[PDB]
Design a protein around this ligand. Structure first.
Ligand code: NDP
Ligand code: NDP
Lengths: 222, 223
């Protein structure tokens, strides 16, 4: 029935999302890892559960992104639900203390990567039924939330991706796409499995485009 | 006396702000161009108003930015009013149709450029009296306005820099800095460069509180 694509599936929320989706009948899961050979838990899941297909992706690497569509296509003729989950969070604290390379790495990995990944997998998503597009954002990316914390290149990258996500939702509303930015929670802290359970109910239930959502389905201000 | 710094002063609003500042007594202007020797208007401006100093800045070029503090330090001990004006606006419309290079170029020129520029000229701004920091933003950069247009890399770059401008306002409030993101208007409702400059100069002088996102007319925009 349905194909999910989850970037960054070897650990954290991505692994827990793939584990949760692997439990549902009639769900095929394209799961990505930078280094699949070292994705122990994900490889063992895929060994027990043939519905889970493991593909290499480095979203920091144009040469990897240029291959994701042809490689995914070996395993599926369509994607129902796209989840750009793979990301970095390596730069917090004041602007004056954040060197050039942190800004660059968060832009390439957290902004350009997800945009190029979507661009490449759009034809596969257009061919699917559900046409859902989820960007795993952060409440730190809001322009209208104050946490009393600096988020530096990490927060900027989530705001940047948020801006483009909102635009994308407008652009693909006439093609009946559902596009969302989703804050997965602080992983008060929640566990990745709890986040994944809530994220997967959201992925299945969300029926409107253009939303910025917390994992529980409540709205966040852009 | 006060020292103003303006990136991208060879044409557009940049030129019009420098021209207006040059008219105000006791103002010295550090004015930037990528190619100061081709900046015929600004060079003539500076010839007639030598309080205007023309320095080389390409905000897309880290090697250029690594030299700005030294180039500016030639002419001043301090900056009272910093203005990141220099920027590009090359990519609009759909994401699927926005190639890699357009995303990269707006990030490097419109986001990284200004943060690097501010990091480099912060010691000079710190020594100054007014501690005013202005990023020429766009209303298109708002996460909370709908123009019935898509702004692609351009709009993303203005929203990215807005996020950091807000953080920078918070971060520098202790040091009594005034940090603002300012939409200068859609200059040639379009308004003239000279109209846009007059509004901005008034804003640059009047603004007394940090963390604001302002249109040229002094009303606030939602982040
Ligand atoms: N959990 C939280 O508290 C919050 C997290 N988020 C969002 O949650 C999402 C998931 O976070 P979480 O699982 O905790 O993060 P982790 O850092 O634990 O995991 C990140 C995942 O992304 C992968 N990844 C990183 N860089 C790349 C790359 N260049 N190419 C491909 N894959 C890559 C990692 O693979 P590898 O093992 O190779 O490094 C890993 O699978 C992120 O997208 C983030 O934006 C937002 C804010 C709050
Ligand atoms: N354009 C607009 O009216 C709108 C955009 N804005 C802001 O307006 C401001 C610019 O106004 P204005 O000058 O009239 O518009 P322009 O269309 O003239 O903007 C280009 C300016 O930036 C300079 N510049 C461009 N690229 C670089 C670079 N890599 N390094 C250094 N300088 C560079 C140009 O110099 P060069 O001649 O060498 O190319 C020129 O001074 C920017 O802050 C922009 O973000 C805000 C709202 C609407």
């Amino acid at each position: 029935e349905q194909t999910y694509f989850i970037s960054g599936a070897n650990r954290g929320i991505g692994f827990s999302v793939v584990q949760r989706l692997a439990a549902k009948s009639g769900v095929k899961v394209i799961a990505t890892a930078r280094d699949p050979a070292s994705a122990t838990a994900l490889n063992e899941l895929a060994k027990e559960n043939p519905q889970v297909k493991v593909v290499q992706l480095d979203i920091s690497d144009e040469e990897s992104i240029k291959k994701i569509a042809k490689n995914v296509s070996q395993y599926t003729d369509s994607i129902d639900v796209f989840v750009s989950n793979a990301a970095i969070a390596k730069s917090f604290g004041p602007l004056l203390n954040t060197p050039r390379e942190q800004w660059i790495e968060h832009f390439f990995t957290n902004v350009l990567g997800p945009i190029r990944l979507f661009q490449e997998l759009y034809p596969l998503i257009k061919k699917g039924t559900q046409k859902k597009v989820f960007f795993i954002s952060s409440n730190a990316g809001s322009l209208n939330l104050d946490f009393g914390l600096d988020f530096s290149a990490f927060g900027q990258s989530k705001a940047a991706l948020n801006y483009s996500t909102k635009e994308l939702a407008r652009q693909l509303k006439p093609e009946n796409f559902i596009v969302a930015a989703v804050h997965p929670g602080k992983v008060t802290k929640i566990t990745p499995e709890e986040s994944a359970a809530a994220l997967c109910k959201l992925f299945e239930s969300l029926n409107t485009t253009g939303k910025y959502l917390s994992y529980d389905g409540t709205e966040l201000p852009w």
